[PDB]
Amino acid sequence: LERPKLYKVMLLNDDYTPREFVTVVLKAVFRMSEDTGRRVMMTAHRFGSAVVVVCERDIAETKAKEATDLGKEAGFPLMFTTEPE
């Protein structure tokens, strides 16, 4: 019954997904406000990726996939990933 291992959900930078689309994905999936979302993007643009949330593995995986799927099915390369903290 040891300490749980939490997972970061990362937003990845890209050149093709519209800024305003990412904002509404972040709002819908992660409840993240406009201002916060825009800081997350600037970070991803500066470093290649940005942490969105850190949570239980199953939940991290589920949200990364829902948020990615929204971009994918719109024809955008938008990608969210998980990584262990």
With residue 81 as reference, give the H or E element that holds it. Answer: strand 80-84
Delimit the domains of the chain by residue range. 1-85
- Do the beta carbons of residue 11 and residue 83 sit within 8 Å? no
**Which pair of structure tokens corresponds to residue 70?**
């929204």
Question: Which residues partner with 4 through β-bridges?
Answer: none
Resolution of the entry in angstroms: 2.0
Place of tokens 């998980």: 82
CATH number of 1-85: 3.30.1390.10
Residue 64 amino acid letter: A
